[model samples]
Target chain A: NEWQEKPSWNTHFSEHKAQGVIVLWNENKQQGFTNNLKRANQAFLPASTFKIPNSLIALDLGVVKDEHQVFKWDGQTRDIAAWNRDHDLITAMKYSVVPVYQEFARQIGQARMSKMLHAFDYGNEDISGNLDSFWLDGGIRISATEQVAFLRKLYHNKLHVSERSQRIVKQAMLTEANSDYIIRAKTGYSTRIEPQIGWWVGWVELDDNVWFFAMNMDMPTADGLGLRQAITKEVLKQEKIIP
Target chain B: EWQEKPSWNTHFSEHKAQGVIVLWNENKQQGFTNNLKRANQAFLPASTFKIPNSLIALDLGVVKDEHQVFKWDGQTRDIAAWNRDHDLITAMKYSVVPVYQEFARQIGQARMSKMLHAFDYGNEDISGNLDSFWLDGGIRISATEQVAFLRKLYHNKLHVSERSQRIVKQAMLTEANSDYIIRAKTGYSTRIEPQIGWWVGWVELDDNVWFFAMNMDMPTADGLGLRQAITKEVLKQEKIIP
Candidate 1:
């Protein structure tokens, strides 16, 4: 009932040739604004956006140690250029390396990961497919609406994990911080599905309020991938959440 | 632009009260206040003085540390939660009158006055009973003064040790999350006419810290709520919460 539709937001989607949905929820007031409520509620693969919780689960279980723990790059090269070097937790997250988190998923194991996902109330709580690739193209799926709800919990350290664990993940998610605002978020791009889906989900801290946002758009081509963050930033600026 | 923030007026009017908020950007060395005149007008410091008082007590060794407990004397107060024993953090959170009164007596007038003068605190008048002067006596501080003093404490520039100020700051922490950290104290002086209420604190961000002080007229008992309510709205409006 608190959700309001902004038809004008469609221009942001069309400008980038994206058919997508965006949900911006204000945590302090428990209010939300969205475009295309139908799509916002529709479940889609979480893709790399799963890294936020993945990092939390990893740190909570001490499976990967602290953020400083390095994951040595195997000699095998990947499609992403940034993955060529050694990556600690921060760089691994910043680059969204698939194999790195996949390795973390394997160490976390199936049962503990399933239990933690249930505790997090994350998506369908399904890790039914291959352990490492489930979130990318397997049974696990979540909606734009669900992403914001999950992020709201992590923002307040209300998740079932230890506060230190939550803080570590939050710090790793930091994208930008200035005197005006702090943006901590993750970007997701899934090419496994037909037409693919690109997701940008995260919260921005401004003033005393944290505004959680989730945007997922159809990516028929690689050119539209940047729209995930571009549209969200446009919407944020339109709402005056950032300068 | 800091001197005239008309947008903050609605919050005060909504509560049927008048108030002033002075916010200082410590990093940028800038200030913002809704009412410049009232921002300089003094009011009884009220319980808000506990922040400085807590520092003074800790520095003078009146209390051992933040964890040092003050046992209840088996006397009940109007506020049910204050009936039990408390340490520095709990006492500050509950604003337990008796516990702080005990601290004031332990701090004594001579040392208390000396510290106040060093802090350049509000008229430096801890007159009347040392235990009750801040609440009912001549000791008064304006919104501007509160912000300045808070900035000093935040930077550990106070006459007290950095450790002492740090402990008090931690005790004053009211809110913390992934977004921001707010350390504040609320003060209500029921002894005065048109009663004075205050919410004073600082918000810590990655790049900067903003110190703010809000003092309002409590026309009725319920008006005490505006001390923080109005301040938060103004902060939200100013985008300082980021």
Candidate 2:
């Protein structure tokens, strides 16, 4: 009785369906999911997580300095309720403030924004010109697998761009809340449109072991906090980093 | 107006709402469409065109064969109507509706379906499995630039797989309806379940040019006669072959 029989494939399938889960364990290169309906590789809107790349591009172009470089908030109030007062790139990123990032994008200008995204191996297709709002509006799509690959490239400082910019960007991603593990994470949430896409992208570095993760949830009411927590829990459990 | 204009740099923005639209002339890559919104790649449901388009994958064993050989349905059925007697392989060659339906379903049954879907070559990603009603429910999706690329592959006859099956599949594509001394086939329909997806696939021999052409009319009623008119006109305009 102690040695219970394993569940059937259909049973496992049913369990996955209820959870809407697609787990990718990179260390093992193993993937398990509840159903075939879910595609693990399709890109979802990255929301604020896009800031990681944006900040990197800004720093590289000298549009902004390192995390310590003070950025005047101008004390401007905006329609977005979450808008905050003056801040630096690190604080703006940590708080996920829209106005601060918007100014950063504007300072980098359209030309620089386009160049940096391509340099980072974002959308390589010969679509319309870069800096078009389409990329911001769910146009910049990358498969989950490709996201991990890009993050790995970032870890190796081989992003085909400036290594200095990469280091600054990586440092910005490191959250003080989680000091034990080098958790470089960002969360994105956009619910203004239909089929809101929640994104959580970053890498967890423990000593020499690095786990690059990208989790996207597409459904109504998919918030950033819920997605980040789910990804953190599942990824930690899968890697056996958390008991 | 006829003079060449400066090409727009599209590489800047990440979120441009653009689709693929490349142009070539005289067997050379000419230029690409910078304004995807203005590019006239045409909206066509790339019916049987995918057969030739996917010749490389099929030849390479990246995709499996139909396994079932060709069989005929002697009964003279109306064009665009579903004919059930044809097997998967023959139906593909003849551009038979039912056979491709089953094949599409089988391909969609596994992870391969998702892999192909990611290619995003077509406008819409089709569900991997075949519906119970088969071809009637599936959407026809293709673009002119994609067709041109498919033609280039056919002319070279160099796919990831051995040249034999690719040539065979390309050869099978050239059936009784082919007229321009090209490896080709046509898909015609009067009324699809929701709309009409008129399709034609061919590779011109004299110039060694390959062409995959289609004229998709959303929400239409009528088959080859009306569809062929548009295709024939395009062929004449392009001067593909005499």
Candidate 3:
């Protein structure tokens, strides 16, 4: 079977009080593995994970102009410390500053946003809520299975978006890299819903081979937030995908 | 001649800045610096004072632990990161001034003055305003003194509790790789004339540690990057890291 449940992976979730699903797709072998197959297919809000596709759409539509273009802060202080200053696309992406991307969403607008979502075959193809917050506000949702598929196409430069645009988004997605491997990922938190969910979706490259992964888990409290990345890294480490 | 490494002068020159790095090799029991005189000259400790302040704060129970939250006053500051609430870890990471200033106020001059003397901190002078002394006041320490103080903290030899030193050391971690780990802090004394920048810490690699302190002429805001850039380059030139 291409889909196999590694029951042993449940310990990671139990330790963190996370009711989540991890879907890993091995590109070369075309195999899929998961800890829970049912949740792997269940859709959830994209949250800031939407930034990956959002960056592409803005770049493709010329809204962002370029990676180096600076977006000035509105001077209205939000809860995050890093968001209070000016940011280029790279810095904003790194910090996951919500207002910067909201500005990008407003610039991209509804017409262009709907067109790109449909063309890219993004999850639910829905931007039906407020133009600036549909993805975060639950107007659109995507499953872990769909997430890995979208990411696989992104990694292969096979998405409907321009190669240059995808390349720019990929560059901004880079979180860690060393001689042995490169990890490009994003973390997402959907606060609009009770018993919120957190997302960590991206791929790892090892010796030219790519492993695409997407995991989203129930975050009952702030303490469970760190487990989004912790569980993902633990799975990758246990599988020997990274040293 | 061996202790004075002229080759490192290019790192400072390349950045259009001037500075000195005092690196003490623990295993070899030797020292290296591009300018021996500058390395020994004292200047205001600036943000680097956070290291000892953190130690004393931890030792004195001013900060309960790394997780203790210092709530934001809701007043915006120059640095974006400082405008929000911070714990000991975040405060140290951002080098948030106001939080540490609060610590100074809480510790007060009576105990702060006494502790600085006990720790043998540079100049041991808290003669200025209680909260701003290290930032713009009488406190001063040279690069040599910085490395000496760091060496004490490395082995928990300071008058502070060993647990406090260990906690402060954990909070100082800035970088890590499979082969090496770097625990450090940066300091900027912008309030002073002929402003100076500092990068002080130690690198643990290859079964040994090297303590370093570098301070440079930071005339412009952009020159701040050179503090760590020049330090890393000098370390690389000395074959300290791959």
The candidate that achieves the highest DockQ relative to the unseen native structure: 1
User: How much is B76 displaced in model 1, in angstroms?
Assistant: 34
Pitting candidate 1 against candidate 2, the one with the higher lDDT is 1
Location of the lowest summed lDDT over 10 successive residues in candidate 1 chain A: A174-183
Deviating ranges (above 4 Å) for candidate 2? A1-38, A79-82, A123-135, A176-180, A222-224, B1-242
* Candidate 1 Cα misplacement greater than 4 A, ranges: B1-242
Per-residue C-alpha lDDT of model 3 across residues B35-78, encoded as one tens digit per residue: 88998889999999999999889999998776577899999889
In terms of docking quality, model 1 is incorrect
Candidate DockQ values, in order, are 0.03, 0.01, 0.02
Q: Can you tell me the DockQ of model 2?
A: 0.01
Per-candidate TM equals: 0.54, 0.42, 0.54
For model 3, the docking class works out as incorrect
List model 1 lDDT by residue over B113-218, tens digit each. 9999999997999888878998888898888889878888877799887668767875786775445668899988789775878899988764468899998888
**Arranged by DockQ, best first:** 1, 3, 2
Candidate 2, position A167, lDDT: 64
Per-residue lDDT of model 2, residues A173-195, tens digit only: 65422213445677776564555
